[PDB]
Write a protein that binds this ligand. Structure first.
Ligand SMILES: *N1CCC[C@H]1C(c1ccccc1)c1ccccc1
Ligand SMILES: *N1CCC[C@H]1C(c1ccccc1)c1ccccc1
Ligand SMILES: [Cl-]
Ligand SMILES: [Cl-]
Ligand SMILES: [Mg+2]
Ligand SMILES: [Mg+2]
Ligand code: NA
Ligand code: NA
Ligand code: NA
Ligand code: NA
Ligand code: NA
Ligand code: NA
Ligand code: NA
Ligand code: NA
Lengths: 228, 6, 228, 6
């Protein structure tokens, strides 16, 4: 694409600069260019990819929620609907872009459990964002579920219960159950079992790993408190 | 519900 | 442009929606479309134009400052300079866009003191932002000064000393003196005389106007405290 | 120095 002439290392370097400047659209374009070099991503590079697109779609989703709320209140001219549709289409485009990167060809080249779970968790997230605005909706929801489920199966087989990627996967799959699948009891069960199994494995961890895991465990507990 | 940041 | 097919009223309506969604790039594009309909802007519409582009360039300037600081620390490969230049060019492009709207043809059609001072203050601001990154620099600085000065001359002739537009003009012209023109004593004098002349005119104001004026007066005082 | 917001 437009990053095709820039060195892989320079794209990564500029993605890190863009993050420091809170220029997340730039950051995402740089990381897209880096992915499209065809090489697998390191752990740090996977995090950069995730941070970049998470922040881009996060702004879009928050905008979409504001406009949809106005649109709904208006139903109790076409401008509100039109502009909501404009944001929604740009949001779907970014989701399609990320899902395209995962399908071409990050996932199929990810053989290590940590990278494969990482990308499958991302796939579930971005189908979940598509589901938030969908009204093919059932197929989109099942795509999110299938991606999360494959990631869960690998993570439970290959990674300790305190692993941050596994914990973050479980947190977001539980949110999917609660917010998308209308399965609040499944969400609660998943978050509780995840929290309890990580608690029992904390004793194996260094101080630094302890901090990483307990941070995510607290977010699991926060949601359980909200849900119960 | 809040999801996993970053 | 790309907004040429949308009604003026719809552009204004969507600019207000974009502000609520904190989508300031959209907001600016909508207000650009509205300006390019050729009609003069109302007071509320002038504020929408200002809010939109202020937020867009504000993000660019903050990004530019982050990258320039890194670039400077690096001087004690080309990626840092390149990316700083990328942001700087996009920043200059938005400044050129706003200045083009003012020159074509907002300023020449502004006959009322409040609208004319408003646009000339904007002209000074956006030349000031160009000066922040300039290394024609003297001509850019004098363009900012000339625009601010014409606005000052009109505001002192046509508007009470508590008028928010006049106060905001004086605040930003004083910042220009301190940060751009290397004239800290002129900045301090201007802010002090502005504050004192507004204080003496507060007794004429309603409760609501009192609040508007004293809010800006407090920012004048904040800068004087920083400067002394 | 802080300028006039908005
Ligand atoms: N957000 C910042 C770092 C990556 C990302 C999540 C995450 C991504 C993919 C799979 C699981 C989690 C994360 C990872 C570790 C710690 C906090 C957040
Ligand atoms: N930022 C929000 C409203 C307009 C703008 C400034 C301002 C613009 C142009 C000339 C003078 C001031 C403003 C105006 C009134 C109150 C606060 C800020
Ligand atoms: Cl629209
Ligand atoms: Cl660049
Ligand atoms: Mg029950
Ligand atoms: Mg002195
Ligand atoms: Na290369
Ligand atoms: Na309308
Ligand atoms: Na749609
Ligand atoms: Na393992
Ligand atoms: Na019309
Ligand atoms: Na380099
Ligand atoms: Na330049
Ligand atoms: Na007057």
């Amino acid at each position: 694409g437009a990053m095709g002439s820039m060195e892989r290392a320079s794209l990564i370097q500029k993605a890190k600069l863009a993050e420091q400047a809170e220029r997340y659209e730039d950051m995402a374009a740089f990381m897209k260019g880096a992915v499209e070099k065809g090489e697998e991503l390191s752990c740090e590079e996977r995090n950069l990819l995730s941070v970049a697109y998470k922040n881009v779609v996060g702004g879009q989703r928050a905008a979409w929620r504001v406009l949809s709320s106005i649109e709904q209140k208006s139903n109790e001219g076409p401008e509100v609907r039109e502009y909501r549709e404009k944001v929604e289409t740009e949001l779907q485009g970014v989701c399609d872009t990320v899902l395209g990167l995962l399908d071409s060809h990050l996932i199929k080249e990810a053989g290590d459990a940590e990278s494969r779970v990482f990308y499958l968790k991302m796939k579930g997230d971005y189908y979940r964002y598509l589901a938030e605005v969908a009204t093919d909706k059932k197929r989109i929801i099942d795509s999110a579920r299938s991606a999360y489920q494959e990631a869960m199966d690998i993570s439970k087989k290959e990674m300790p219960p305190t692993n941050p990627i596994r914990l973050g996967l479980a947190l977001n799959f539980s949110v999917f159950h609660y917010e998308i699948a209308n399965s609040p009891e499944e969400a609660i069960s998943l978050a509780k079992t995840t929290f309890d199994e990580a608690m029992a494995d904390l004793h194996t961890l260094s101080e630094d790993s302890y901090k990483d895991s307990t941070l995510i465990m607290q977010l699991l507990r926060d949601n359980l408190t909200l849900w119960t | 519900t809040p999801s996993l940041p970053x």
